[PDB]
Ligand binder design. Structure first.
Ligand SMILES: Nc1ncnc2c1ncn2[C@@H]1O[C@H](COP(=O)(O)OP(=O)(O)O)[C@@H](O)[C@H]1O
Ligand SMILES: Nc1ncnc2c1ncn2[C@@H]1O[C@H](COP(=O)(O)OP(=O)(O)O)[C@@H](O)[C@H]1O
Ligand SMILES: [Mg+2]
Ligand SMILES: [Mg+2]
Lengths: 371, 118, 74, 160, 371
């Protein structure tokens, strides 16, 4: 039979059968209970709208993501999300399909063990396998080397790989991602008068960020230009009218990636954690990693980031090496495409964690040889 | 340098190549026929005692066993060369698969067409 | 690899392929028929082996072109 | 070559429906008398899914190479083949390997330039600007005069 | 048929058919297992890369030479190296070719006996013969007398020969060679800030030594000059950029040959062990040995050594004798060229150790008449 390549993510759940080009169903991972009282009788009001249904009734819900930073903080809601994904968005019972979840690097063990225990006890799948979210993104590019920066919505991690041999001592995981950029944008919009507070209006700020923000090639020059002319002010129409005008908030929101001091984080930007991740590698594979830097994940879709990052790394790196940044147009679904490719391989067909194996060793089987 | 001229030239040369490939195939077929015909060592089957008949057929049995043993040896050797070719195929396919390995997949079924139903 | 085992397999096949026939187990004419049957079987064997030599020559072709490309990579 | 096989395989269940539906949709007549002899453009425009331009150009040129300017049922099937993916799709890579084996039957480790010379002599195509140029550039893909296997391998690959 | 003239060496395996001018395949003798984990599936990752393949993937391997000082310390790896040499670099099955190995003087017996036992049992050659590495280097020079200093990469030995009669009591074998010079260079580079530690970076230090170091004609004058001017500082580009500048480390690394007290060795330099080896010879053949001093081996390729050694010996030797140092341009492959010449001789054709002889007397046949 065919395998189910699910990809929990944090912000958008992407799923679909193995062997295709794009995920079959992509929908936000939010579960929102209603918060008001409700007076109409017999309206058929449910107790929790999940997935894309709660992005249409979000006016009277309190949306809450079940995955904070890679890790899962609310297991009941995550179980509900998985149940919805299997039964309503794909309509395939899990009793007859292997599953291939994905997990960020350096995550707590208990999260992974609980994930496999749920998949084997509640949904009762035949066999499931958990894979690191960066190796798949490297599969999708058709490479076999390279250092991949997978800046998702929950957590940004940077896994270097050479000739198929991952370097476990050079993984640099940073917890700044799309959600913190949304919060920072929502916080700097208040400097013009627009106040978004409700958890429903966070979605509106996210839409503003997606449609308007861009990464500046040079920050100081853009700050000077936006403060003199008015060629940058782009307007946007809220879900009820009252258009708003975003000035130099456009390139200040995604600039937080390269200067995490804006949101008070100490660490260095995504332009310098990649160079540090390279320098921890051996001295003889640094040229190949320099030449095959891969971008993935949703948050790396800002217009103009593949040039800013290349300029920064070229500034840091030695002058002789060639710096090349691979930015495929299908960046958002790169991890899932790689997952489909991996699940479609014949050599991989014996790596699944078969159910009888789980029955013999318990949920701690995932840390064992079947990784 | 014209594209039309280039395509005409490659088309004609490709067809000549295909014709010569069929020529080589039938040439090998004729060579095989000749080799099989010359393999046979005829025997004077008439006017011999039946025990001698059994003796001669047993001698041919020994010849057959030896010949199939030679075939086994050469098959094993060409099989080891097959393993070597598989290794070298792994070498080239790895050097190129570093960029074009995941090409093996199934795409363009229903998401690319069925979209207005939702 | 480990030619003793490979030769062992060869001898197992040959002893298996040593279809020695007994005394009163055919006709003299049937004996001729079986002899010719072995003849034709071995002729087909020779055709297969000749094609095998051709394909092995092509294998050598692929080997030399492959190693030449390998050297070109350096 | 594969052209006649693709033409015969046009008789199927999907492309038959395609030809029928297209005929019922935008092949009727009742024009001003201009005679849409070049209605292949109409079919390509009305397809709604343009294939790779190689099929379209082969239909444009290869068809009516005598300049008939007329399309019959068989040519309708030819156009329908040009629509869907009925191509040989580069023939067999085994064909490429066997052809290069016959080329370097001399065991040069590559197709020698004299192999190309004899093959051109067999094909007899006039030596144009493209002639010899293709041979040398393929042989000198490294641009060093050294002809390697993968050079002509990719030179002949991608074609039927 | 033709004979296989293999030459194990220590650092570079040189092999080729008898009767040519240069070895057919020359490649480092290192076998390196991968050390990281490896995450890509189906990449076709082998368990040990040997020869020149492990000098390209050395970024993720742990290279380890199977021959320490002439002697062989790891027989499985040496067998792997031989198998590679026969099957992939020459592509000739050993069942149909005599072999002519080479061995340093004064080596343990067990090493030689194990070598012949391997060649006769595993590879199953028709006949093999073991020859002393210095007599061949004397063959290649076309001489018949002379004292040859064969400073390889493992061990430096100094065999005097007169009129074809070797003098077994005058062989002076010293264990300082190219490898110790590489280690000493790697140790003195730390005085400028460059630290090379990994077994892969030893190869980089070896390349630095080969391309930059030279032997000073007079040591104190060079030390004084390099400490005042800056005309010696030559720069070199690492495999990733960050050029380095070598100052007076250039002529201090190969100076260890003439003053083995630098690396703590007690013995005298290669300039004085040659004179001692001569003085042990008889009083009537000292003039010929003085006039026909031969250099060989890789490590004697330093620019300016054929003058320093001549100056030193002229200082030591009596003033009347003429001191001449033969330094052919084909120094590195001198031993192998001599091996080819010896294997091509008709008079030598009956000295091989035929397999039936080994079957009758066991591996201890090598010490017997067939030397
Ligand atoms: N076109 C876009 N431009 C800018 N940001 C985007 C775009 N699309 C998505 N994002 C950001 O990326 C996030 C989605 O990232 P995604 O890759 O789905 O995360 P995950 O790894 O959890 O799947 C969204 O929250 C959004 O903030
Ligand atoms: N051009 C060169 N200049 C200086 N040193 C060299 C040069 N070439 C080789 N060497 C040194 O000699 C060694 C090779 O010696 P070689 O003669 O191959 O040893 P063996 O006797 O084991 O074959 C290398 O390790 C290197 O350190
Ligand atoms: Mg992700
Ligand atoms: Mg030597």
């Amino acid at each position: 039979t065919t395998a189910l390549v699910c990809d929990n993510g944090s912000g958008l759940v992407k799923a679909g059968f193995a062997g295709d080009d794009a995920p079959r169903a992509v929908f936000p991972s939010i579960v929102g209970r209603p918060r008001h009282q409700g007076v109409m009788v017999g309206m058929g009001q449910k107790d929790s709208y999940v997935g894309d249904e709660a992005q249409s009734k979000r006016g009277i819900l309190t949306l809450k993501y079940p995955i904070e930073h890679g890790i899962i903080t609310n297991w009941d809601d995550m179980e509900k999300i998985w149940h919805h994904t299997f039964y309503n968005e794909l309509r395939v019972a899990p009793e007859e399909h292997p599953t291939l979840l994905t997990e960020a690097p350096l995550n707590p063990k208990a999260n992974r063990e609980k994930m496999t225990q749920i998949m084997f006890e509640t949904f009762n799948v035949p066999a499931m396998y958990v894979a690191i979210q960066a190796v798949l993104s490297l599969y999708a590019s058709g490479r076999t080397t390279g250092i991949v920066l997978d800046s998702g919505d929950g957590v940004t991690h940077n896994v270097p790989i050479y000739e198929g041999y991952a370097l476990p001592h050079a993984i640099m995981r940073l917890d700044l991602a799309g959600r913190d950029l949304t919060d920072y944008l929502m916080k700097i919009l208040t400097e013009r008068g627009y106040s978004f507070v409700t958890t429903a209006e966070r979605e509106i700020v996210r839409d503003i960020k997606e449609k308007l923000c861009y990464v500046a090639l040079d920050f100081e020059n853009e700050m000077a230009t936006a403060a003199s002319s008015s060629s940058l002010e782009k307007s946007y129409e809220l879900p009820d009218g009252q258009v708003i005008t975003i000035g130099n908030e456009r390139f200040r929101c995604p600039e937080t990636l390269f200067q995490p001091s804006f949101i008070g984080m100490e660490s260095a930007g995504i332009h310098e954690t990649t160079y540090n991740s390279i320098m921890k590698c051996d001295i003889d594979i640094r040229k190949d990693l320099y030449a095959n830097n891969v971008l993935s994940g949703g948050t790396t879709m800002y217009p103009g980031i593949a040039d800013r990052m290349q300029k920064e790394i070229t500034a840091l790196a030695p002058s002789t090496m060639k710096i090349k940044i691979i930015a495929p147009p299908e960046r958002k679904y790169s991890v899932w495409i790689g997952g489909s490719i991996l699940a479609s391989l014949s050599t991989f067909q014996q790596m699944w964690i078969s159910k009888q194996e789980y029955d013999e060793a318990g949920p701690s089987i995932v840390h064992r040889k079947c990784f | 340098i014209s594209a039309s001229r280039k395509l005409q030239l490659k088309t004609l040369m490709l067809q000549i190549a295909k014709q010569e490939m069929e020529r080589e195939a039938e040439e090998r077929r004729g060579e095989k026929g000749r080799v099989l015909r010359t393999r046979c060592q005829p025997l004077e089957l008439d006017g011999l005692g039946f025990e001698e008949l059994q003796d001669l057929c047993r001698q041919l049995h020994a010849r057959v066993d030896k010949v199939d043993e030679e075939r086994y040896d050469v098959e094993a050797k060409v099989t080891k060369n097959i393993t070597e070719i598989a290794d070298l195929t792994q070498k080239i396919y790895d050097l190129r698969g570093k960029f074009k390995r995941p090409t093996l997949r199934r795409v363009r079924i229903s998401a690319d067409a069925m979209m207005q139903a939702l | 690899g480990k030619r003793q085992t490979e030769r062992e397999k060869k001898k197992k096949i040959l002893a298996e392929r040593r279809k020695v026939l007994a005394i009163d187990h055919l006709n003299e004419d049937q004996l001729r028929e079986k002899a010719k049957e072995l003849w034709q079987s071995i002729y087909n064997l020779e055709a297969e082996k000749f094609d095998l030599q051709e394909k092995f020559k092509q294998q050598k072709y692929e080997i030399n072109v492959l190693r030449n490309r390998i050297n070109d990579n350096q | 070559d594969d052209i006649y096989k693709a033409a015969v395989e046009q008789l199927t269940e999907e492309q038959k429906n395609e030809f029928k539906a297209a005929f019922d949709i935008f092949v009727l007549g009742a024009e001003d008398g201009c005679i849409s002899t070049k209605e292949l453009g109409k079919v390509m425009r009305m397809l709604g899914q343009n294939p790779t331009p190689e099929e379209l150009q082969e239909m444009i040129d290869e068809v009516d190479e005598d300049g008939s300017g007329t399309v019959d049922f068989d040519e309708f099937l030819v156009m329908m083949v040009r629509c869907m993916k009925d191509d040989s799709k580069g023939k067999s890579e085994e064909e490429l390997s066997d052809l290069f084996r016959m080329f370097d039957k001399n065991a040069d480790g590559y197709i020698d330039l004299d192999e190309l010379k004899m093959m051109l002599q067999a094909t007899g195509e006039t030596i144009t600007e493209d002639d010899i140029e293709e041979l040398m550039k393929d042989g000198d893909k490294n641009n060093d005069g050294r002809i390697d296997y993968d050079e002509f391998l990719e030179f002949m690959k991608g074609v039927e």
